[PDB]
Design a protein around this ligand. Structure first.
Ligand SMILES: *[C@@H]1O[C@H](CO)[C@@H](O[C@@H]2O[C@H](CO)[C@@H](O)[C@H](O)[C@H]2NC(C)=O)[C@H](O)[C@H]1NC(C)=O
Ligand SMILES: *[C@@H]1O[C@H](CO)[C@@H](O[C@@H]2O[C@H](CO)[C@@H](O)[C@H](O)[C@H]2NC(C)=O)[C@H](O)[C@H]1NC(C)=O
Ligand SMILES: CC(=O)N[C@@H]1[C@@H](O)[C@H](O)[C@@H](CO)O[C@H]1O
Ligand SMILES: *[C@@H]1O[C@H](CO)[C@@H](O)[C@H](O)[C@H]1NC(C)=O
Ligand SMILES: *[C@@H]1O[C@H](CO)[C@@H](O)[C@H](O)[C@H]1NC(C)=O
Ligand SMILES: *[C@@H]1O[C@H](CO)[C@@H](O)[C@H](O)[C@H]1NC(C)=O
Ligand SMILES: *[C@@H]1O[C@H](CO)[C@@H](O)[C@H](O)[C@H]1NC(C)=O
Ligand SMILES: *[C@@H]1O[C@H](CO)[C@@H](O)[C@H](O)[C@H]1NC(C)=O
Ligand SMILES: *[C@@H]1O[C@H](CO)[C@@H](O)[C@H](O)[C@H]1NC(C)=O
Ligand SMILES: *[C@@H]1O[C@H](CO)[C@@H](O)[C@H](O)[C@H]1NC(C)=O
Ligand SMILES: *[C@@H]1O[C@H](CO)[C@@H](O)[C@H](O)[C@H]1NC(C)=O
Ligand SMILES: [Zn+2]
Length: 860
């Protein structure tokens, strides 16, 4: 029986370095194992308890200091926690380095987790092989026996003997390689800096490269040869972002090398590794001419994310997974924070803003879970990998860093960085580096533990009565009894009174009610500047009709982030009931004079949730009258859009937003303009450039014709550009021919012309529009069994198939059906977070109709 009945390893033994030698042949999917672990005892144990899985071990056994002579112990194992224990020939006395050596058999993974391998086809013919690693969170132990926790850091020599052609890559630069007798090469890499078991990485496959030397460290993007041509932007961007993390962290990237790799597969594990960043082929390949704003915006942030992860996560790692949200939260913040100081032209705050919106309305559900609390098993380690925690974390740092200065934020960041580099940490340690705020401690970061420890976010009510600012707080709950919900809240607020002179100020509300005194007597006040604070603000009734009046006068007295914030808020409140729906729509009656994208898209987002909810109920006429009045507010901006790619990113994303609003709903010249552009494009065997900005729109309109449908289907199964094939798939699923809509899903499910990864994106698209709406949900239930086979229950795709099939229902008849269907298979499924959040969204719609179907009749 085995000497350790816990899931965490013992504090008994500690690794100091790892030495690893491996023979995978990619052709037969098998490999050599050999690990030498230079450990060290800190307390007496008869065993070394450590992690190992899937290893068929031949010979293993144990040294001391003292002797280069080695002596035979035998392994005991325990597969339930992945652990193995070596029964030591003699007592590990405290303070002594011993070294441990393991030989093993193993299989190369055929999933895409751990040490995995796959095949792909060439431009010229050919069957190529390839293998890589993906060790988060607990996968390293599958490749090689080790202390697989993030606290147990160490140093690494990895050496991999690989056939002549393949380029072997790994963390540290390749020190040496030496020809072996059969035709095989032996690659050895430098010993690694101190780093965590999960960050180890190594690649075997036929690539080329493209390099540049920022200062001392040299940056290179590795891709399969085909077109290493288009890693040119990736390369140039890693470069400026590299000496953008730079100086700001005031720490220098410790490695001599930094290599990014475009792995040639769609299920590629893309991750953080030090000196060996992975990506899916798709997310890196970019082309100045044929590729849109979306895929630059996306490739720029994807780089900027895994780059800050260098400092955050690798350099300074978690004690344990209970704090993952911190790094991924911080990285996600940097991703949006670097960009708007190097690439201020992308308007990457807009992405950010909307990202925060969608964060809050799922942080407002009751399915929500506060981001920090004890983890103890691994369904609890991978439950932490939902990007809701990441984005919320991200939101907190922007709120923390605009309350404290950006400078104050920086040094406390920098001060955080220096104090425990190469070390493991817990959450509160960052809050302490901050409490070296001020000359040294003027307020505590007990503040941040109110946000971390409680689900949801405060609703801040503001009333104002001639002197004043009466500020009160409660949890934003979506209705039908606990109150130790209290937040420490930075209250940015901006006003205007006297002379058109904008006064803005900060103040931290740390009790249930409070009050701030303004200097002048204003006509309007706005709370939460640029939505810097993660919360919703509700006003008393002629404080709301102050701002709206003010928006019809001169709205540009506010930012576009503020304006977008009111539109967000006023609509979500009128959902919760705290405002009539008709004063949301009088807020956006402003929009005749709007020119910034951020508020227009957010209003268009809102109005079209309303459009679709109505449309799925029978109330089609109400729905249609709704959009045409949005259309009329935005009528000039719509026509003045040119069907082009010309302009600032912001004004391009606006252009693409306005143009397929007007087209989705057939409003004005727009559908025709588009359908000429489609015939020209289709005339030309595809051989004509569509402005990528109007490309998804042009495709939709054409997908509405059996001629057009069948063309675009040929272009899907033929053309190479995976970017444009999702704007084609989209269209194919924006048909209203039900038989096709079914056949798309039926086929994506069977992996026929569309790989099964895309079905979740198909299903969401079919069901979102009236003709497919019931068809989607029925597909989801008619093949539920085969849906659980290829997406493991609770995974982020069975996620969406239920979210995106059902989130539009609004009748208690439907509600019953959804719940009757899910309980009717399993109760273990029936109380999945995904499933009763699915159910939770549906009554919120019923509630929404119950309060706002309304009287849509007397207006609208
Ligand atoms: C995996 O096993 C195969 C088969 O033993 C090894 O194969 C050879 O591949 C080279 C080219 O890469 C050919 O020139 C040889 O003729 C092949 N030999 C045979 C017997 O098929 C392969 O090298 C092994 N992989 C590794 C990494 O050692
Ligand atoms: C990536 O390709 C580049 C060519 O664009 C290689 O660059 C030179 O590589 C040789 C080979 O070691 C060096 O001796 C030269 O010093 C490099 N050029 C300069 C200006 O320094 C690069 O080596 C390739 N990547 C790898 C890993 O070899
Ligand atoms: C783990 C640790 O040392 N924490 C302390 C913290 O308790 C203290 O308040 C702070 C003051 O700067 O210094 C640090
Ligand atoms: C691996 O395969 C089995 C154990 O599952 C055993 O018969 C065989 O000898 C093992 N190979 C080595 C090299 O230990
Ligand atoms: C080896 O052990 C000694 C004490 O036994 C310790 O002082 C030393 O640091 C260890 N070696 C390394 C490289 O740390
Ligand atoms: C690889 O998988 C086979 C089953 O397909 C198993 O018998 C074998 O033991 C595995 N290899 C190791 C090292 O466990
Ligand atoms: C290059 O050299 C060192 C990096 O170690 C740094 O002090 C210096 O500022 C760097 N300069 C630039 C332009 O990156
Ligand atoms: C170092 O960490 C300790 C926690 O023991 C903390 O109190 C201290 O403020 C940190 N110092 C810096 C400069 O971050
Ligand atoms: C607000 O004004 C009153 C005096 O009119 C003062 O007593 C109170 O402390 C002020 N509050 C703040 C937060 O400045
Ligand atoms: C948008 O608002 C008005 C134009 O109606 C103008 O004052 C303002 O500068 C415009 N901003 C941009 C970026 O065009
Ligand atoms: C259209 O182009 C494809 C290559 O992308 C080619 O295979 C096909 O035969 C062409 N069609 C015609 C009618 O020439
Ligand atoms: Zn990340």
């Amino acid at each position: 029986l085995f000497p350790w009945a816990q899931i965490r390893l013992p504090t008994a033994v500690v690794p100091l370095r790892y030495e690893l030698s491996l023979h995978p042949n990619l052709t037969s999917m098998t490999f050599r194992g050999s690990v030498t672990i230079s450990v060290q005892a800190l307390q007496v144990t008869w065993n070394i308890i450590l992690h190992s899985t899937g290893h068929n071990i031949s010979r293993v056994t144990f040294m001391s200091a003292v002797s280069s002579q080695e002596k035979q112990a035998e392994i005991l194992e325990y597969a339930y926690h992945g652990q193995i224990a070596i029964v030591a020939p003699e007592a590990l006395l405290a303070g002594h380095n011993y070294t441990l050596k393991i030989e093993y058999s193993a299989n190369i993974s055929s999933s895409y987790y751990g040490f995995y391998g796959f095949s792909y086809t060439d431009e010229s013919n050919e069957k190529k092989y390839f293998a890589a690693t993906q060790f988060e969170p607990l996968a390293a132990r599958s490749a090689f026996p080790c202390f697989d926790e993030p606290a147990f850091k160490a140093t690494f020599i990895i050496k991999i003997i690989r056939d002549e052609q393949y380029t072997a890559l790994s963390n540290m630069p390749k020190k040496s390689s030496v020809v072996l007798d059969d035709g095989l090469v032996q690659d050895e890499f430098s010993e690694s800096v101190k780093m965590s078991t999960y960050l180890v990485a190594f690649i075997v496959g036929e690539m080329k490269n493209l390099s540049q030397d920022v200062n001392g460290t040299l940056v290179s993007i590795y891709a399969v040869p085909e077109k290493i041509g288009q890693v040119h932007y990736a390369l140039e961007t890693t470069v400026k972002l590299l000496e953008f993390f730079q100086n700001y962290f005031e720490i220098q990237y410790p490695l001599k090398k930094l290599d990014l790799v475009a792995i040639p597969d769609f299920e590629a594990g893309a991750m953080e590794n030090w000196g060996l960043l992975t990506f899916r082929e798709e997310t890196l390949l970019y082309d100045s001419n044929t590729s849109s704003m979306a895929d630059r915006k996306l490739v720029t942030k994807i780089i900027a994310h895994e780059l800050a992860h260098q400092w955050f996560g690798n350099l300074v790692t978690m004690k344990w997974w209970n704090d993952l949200w911190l790094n991924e939260g911080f990285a996600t913040f940097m991703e949006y924070f670097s960009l708007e100081k190097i690439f201020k032209e992308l308007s990457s705050y807009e992405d950010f803003l909307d990202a925060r919106f969608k964060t809050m309305k799922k942080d407002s559900l009751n399915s929500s879970h506060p981001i920090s609390s004890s983890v103890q098993s691994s369904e609890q380690i991978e439950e932490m990998f939902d990007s809701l925690s990441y984005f919320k974390g991200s939101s907190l740092l922007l709120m923390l860093k605009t309350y404290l200065s950006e400078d104050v934020f920086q040094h406390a960041v920098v001060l955080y960085l220096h104090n425990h580099s190469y070390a493991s940490i817990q959450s509160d340690d960052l809050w302490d580096s901050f409490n070296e705020v001020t000359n040294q401690t003027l307020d505590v970061k007990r503040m941040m533990k109110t946000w971390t420890l409680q689900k949801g976010f405060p609703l801040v009510t503001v009333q104002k009565k001639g002197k004043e600012l009466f500020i009160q707080q409660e949890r934003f709950f979506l209705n039908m009894s606990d109150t130790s919900y209290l937040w420490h809240i930075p209250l940015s607020y901006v006003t205007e009174g006297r002379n058109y002179s904008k006064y803005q100020s900060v103040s931290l509300l740390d009790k249930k009610s409070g009050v701030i005194n303004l200097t002048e007597e204003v006509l309007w006040v706005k709370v939460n500047i640029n939505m810097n604070g993660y919360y919703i603000v509700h006003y008393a009734d002629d404080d709301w009709e102050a701002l709206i009046h003010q928006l019809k006068i001169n709205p540009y007295v506010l930012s576009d982030k503020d304006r977008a914030n009111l539109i967000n808020n006023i609509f979500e409140l009128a959902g919760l009931g705290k405002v009539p729906l008709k004063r949301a729509f009088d807020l956006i009656n402003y929009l005749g004079n709007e020119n910034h994208t951020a508020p227009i898209t957010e209003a268009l987002f809102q109005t079209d949730l309303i459009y679709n909810l109505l449309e799925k109920l029978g109330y089609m006429d109400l729905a249609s009258r709704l959009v045409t009045r949005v259309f009329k507010l935005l009528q000039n901006q719509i026509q003045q859009q040119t069907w082009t790619d010309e302009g600032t990113p912001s004004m391009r994303e606006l252009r693409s937003a306005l143009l397929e609003f007007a087209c989705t709903h057939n409003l004005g010249n727009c559908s025709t303009t588009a359908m000429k552009l489609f015939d020209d494009w289709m005339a030309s065997n595809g051989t004509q450039s569509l402005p990528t900005d109007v490309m998804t729109t042009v495709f939709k309109v054409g997908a509405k014709t059996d001629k057009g449908w069948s063309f675009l289907l040929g272009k899907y199964i033929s053309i190479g550009s995976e970017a444009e094939k999702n704007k084609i798939l989209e269209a194919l699923a924006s048909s209203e021919d039900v038989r096709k809509l079914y056949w798309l899903m039926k086929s994506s499910l069977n992996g026929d012309n569309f790989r099964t990864q895309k079905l979740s994106f198909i299903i969401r698209t079919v069901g979102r529009h009236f003709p497919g709406h019931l068809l989607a949900w029925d597909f989801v239930k008619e093949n539920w069994n085969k849906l659980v086979q290829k997406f493991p229950l609770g995974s982020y795709t069975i996620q969406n198939i239920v979210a995106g099939s059902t989130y539009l229902f609004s009748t208690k008849t439907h509600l019953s059906e959804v719940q009757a269907f899910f309980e009717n298979q399993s109760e273990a499924t029936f109380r999945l977070r995904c499933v009763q959040e699915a159910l939770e969204v549906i009554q919120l719609n019923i509630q929404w109709m119950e309060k706002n179907l309304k009287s849509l009749t007397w207006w609208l």
